[PDB]
Design a protein around this ligand. Structure first.
Ligand code: CA
Ligand code: CA
Ligand code: CA
Lengths: 280, 315, 176
């Protein structure tokens, strides 16, 4: 109940789409008590099958060869995080051993274990396989909040699917819920924007068609400088109330040196390894 | 050794023994791995160097069982870290053995073999200035069903007996359960266990059992003509059929003729071949994996890429 | 960091508590003083429907680590330092997230009741700032003064939105 409820209420959200998906859970332990009530509430697009994802007959029972993706959820409160991650990598290799082409999304408790996931020969993030590392993202949201307090709650609100709740009173919740109503979305930039510089198209999309644009695919660039200009076929990252509002980012024409200071890549600062007695 | 010392210590043709283990874990019994590799059957230049990679906290409380053997080393580390395996030149070894002491401390059929499977995948997936998939590995499995996760270019079904599976047929997986049938085999014929022990242990005889029973350590002695006479026994070997004396017949020729000439000229008594998994197919393939043929019939056909299992005399 | 998100009710005493309330509605979460791993549960669904989201969030949050860093750390398990080069230095030229006080010289001219859209447009053209929200004092809309220094988060305000002089601006700013 504690692992799937927050997931279901966002996957099956009222504002999501006209077409449904998912419907398949499998787990070795039966859904006792309240969990089954939660399945009843969603019975028209949720089904549970008792089984273990290590057994290829159970993978056949839930028709893995036909699934769009497989989602692996972690025991966030386990006594041995590396045991959980090794277990979930065992689940990943079971699934990939059964079927090369299924897309996999998995929760990882500790960062270093993500390396193991890359050893599997049929895994490729270029095709949308990826791992959500909870320690990495938790401590990162906190770290960015040390630079700008409140940023963790901003980022956390950009994923969860939320409507615009209207509030008639003047309390802080009114303005807050207005801000909560949007999500991070993405769309390909209309050819009308090609050949000219990123700040100008941010200004255009914000002013004229009310979209806030954060980043572009020059692999993945947040807020790139005025020297950089839009190539054809580029993908933009937008903050917006609903996905349908972002499509006018496409449907548009004229509508109206001797010392080591850094890591080997230059991405992070670095220094020689200190004994702990030097820093205590 | 530390990783820098190992990296400058040029190792090749060696044996790397990756051990998952812990201060409190059950003792593996590593003397029995080292002794067959230290039979007087080999010349001192012929002995393969042995490197243990693992917890020194585990290895310390076993060292006194094997500290009387030459060409042995320890790297304190983990089989799961690329840096350690690069430091011990994993791409140049003759064998990588993967073992776990932690077989009994948790029971869930998944949780029994996690580390060994991850280690084998970690080695396979490396790159060297070749990829690591060509490295010879043998993995001990606690639960034989987990064999299905060791290879990905094969067909899996849990109802299959272990001996039918590809990594077992290739000799890259081993499980204690394959010794269950040694009970029955020994009941019906007491000579089998005798032969297998002399073939497998390095040839230990009841005098060694008595000496070890009394002293619990292998006591060294000064050499004599009789001491040296005990060296003149056969050792098991693999021969590449591309070698000068036999490439004349490894061209589509006859296993029986190969047996007969190698037996008369060298007393070789070759008892099987190790055959590339795709060598019967018409198309070329990049797969270097081999599987085992025991006692082929006289008329059996010899492809030039084959390896010969044989027994060869001392010199 | 909270292990159990219901315990959020004990962090503040000048607020209203009810255990049926979702965490995101509560005052210490809206202010960004509480965080719980459960708010990442919906990142599973968000990542299924759009694989680009996890990419953006990782580059925005980790400091910008790319697959080359993942490979180097996977091989060596420690961050290996290196000597600087023009390309090494080129990798520094990326945006960092920042908070700006609206009382500062360049923007106090407009933080007087003025317009968030105008602030966005001038900061974008003159400094490439791309400010994406404000951090607003919890009582600043009230007519009475207050001693409360607590602030809460407004993401992507509309163009016409009104700027009180005490506000803080979330923004992305270039290297120099
Ligand atoms: Ca939202
Ligand atoms: Ca397999
Ligand atoms: Ca309270």
């Amino acid at each position: 109940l504690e692992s799937v409820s927050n997931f279901l209420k966002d996957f099956l959200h009222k504002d999501r789409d006209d077409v449904n998906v998912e419907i398949v859970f499998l787990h070795n332990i039966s859904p006792n008590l309240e969990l089954e009530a939660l399945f009843k509430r969603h019975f028209t697009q949720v089904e549970f099958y008792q089984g273990s994802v290590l057994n290829p007959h159970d993978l056949a029972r839930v028709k893995i060869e036909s699934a769009d993706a497989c989602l692996i959820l972690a025991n966030k409160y386990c006594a041995d995080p590396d045991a959980e991650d090794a277990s979930n990598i065992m689940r990943v290799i079971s699934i990939k051993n059964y079927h090369p082409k299924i897309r996999i999304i998995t929760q990882m408790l500790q960062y270093h274990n993500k390396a193991h996931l890359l050893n599997i020969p049929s895994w490729n993030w270029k095709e949308g396989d990826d791992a959500i590392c909870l320690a990495e993202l938790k401590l990162g949201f906190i770290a960015q909040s040390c630079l700008a307090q409140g940023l963790s709650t901003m980022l956390a609100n950009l994923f969860s699917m939320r409507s615009f709740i209207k509030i008639e009173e003047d309390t802080w919740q009114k303005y807050y819920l207005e801000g909560v109503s949007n999500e991070m979305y993405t769309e390909y930039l209309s050819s009308a924007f090609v050949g000219l510089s990123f700040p100008t198209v941010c200004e255009l999309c914000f002013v004229k068609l009310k979209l806030l644009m954060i980043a572009i695919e020059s692999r993945i660039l947040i807020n790139p400088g005025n020297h950089l200009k839009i190539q054809e076929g580029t993908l933009g990252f937008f903050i917006a109330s609903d996905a349908k509002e972002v499509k006018r980012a496409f449907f548009y024409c004229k509508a109206c040196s001797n010392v080591k200071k850094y890591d080997s890549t230059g991405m992070f600062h670095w220094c020689a390894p200190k004994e702990i007695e030097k820093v205590i | 050794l530390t990783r820098s010392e190992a990296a400058m210590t040029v190792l090749s043709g060696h044996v790397v023994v990756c051990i998952f283990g812990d201060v409190s874990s059950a003792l593996i019994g590593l003397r029995n791995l080292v002794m067959p590799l230290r039979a007087s059957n080999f010349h001192y230049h012929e002995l393969k160097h042995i490197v243990f990679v693992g917890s020194i906290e585990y290895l310390k409380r076993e060292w006194e069982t094997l500290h009387n053997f030459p060409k042995v080393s320890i790297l304190p580390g983990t089989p799961l870290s690329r840096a350690d395996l690069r430091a011990v030149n994993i791409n140049l070894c003759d064998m990588c053995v993967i073992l776990s002491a932690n077989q009994n401390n948790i029971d869930d059929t998944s949780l029994q073999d996690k580390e060994c499977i991850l280690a084998s995948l970690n080695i396979k997936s490396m790159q060297f200035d070749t990829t690591g998939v060509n490295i010879p590995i043998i993995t001990e499995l606690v639960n034989d069903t987990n064999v299905q996760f060791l290879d990905q270019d094969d067909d899996d079904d849990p109802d299959t007996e272990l001996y039918l599976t590809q990594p077992f047929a290739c000799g890259t997986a081993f499980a204690v359960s394959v010794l269950d049938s040694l009970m029955s085999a020994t009941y019906f014929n007491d000579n089998i266990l005798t032969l297998i022990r002399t073939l497998v242990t390095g040839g230990a005889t009841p005098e060694l059992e008595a000496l070890i029973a009394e002293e619990n350590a292998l006591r060294g002695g000064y050499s004599t003509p009789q001491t040296l006479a005990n060296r003149d026994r056969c050792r098991v070997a693999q021969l590449a059929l591309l070698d000068g004396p036999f490439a004349d017949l490894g061209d589509g020729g006859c296993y029986g003729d190969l047996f007969c000439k190698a037996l008369k000229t060298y007393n070789m008594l070759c008892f099987g071949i190790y055959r590339l998994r795709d060598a019967h197919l018409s198309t070329p393939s990049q797969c270097t994996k081999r599987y085992v043929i025991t006692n082929p019939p006289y008329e059996f056909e010899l492809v030039p890429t084959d390896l010969i299992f044989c027994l060869m005399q001392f010199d």
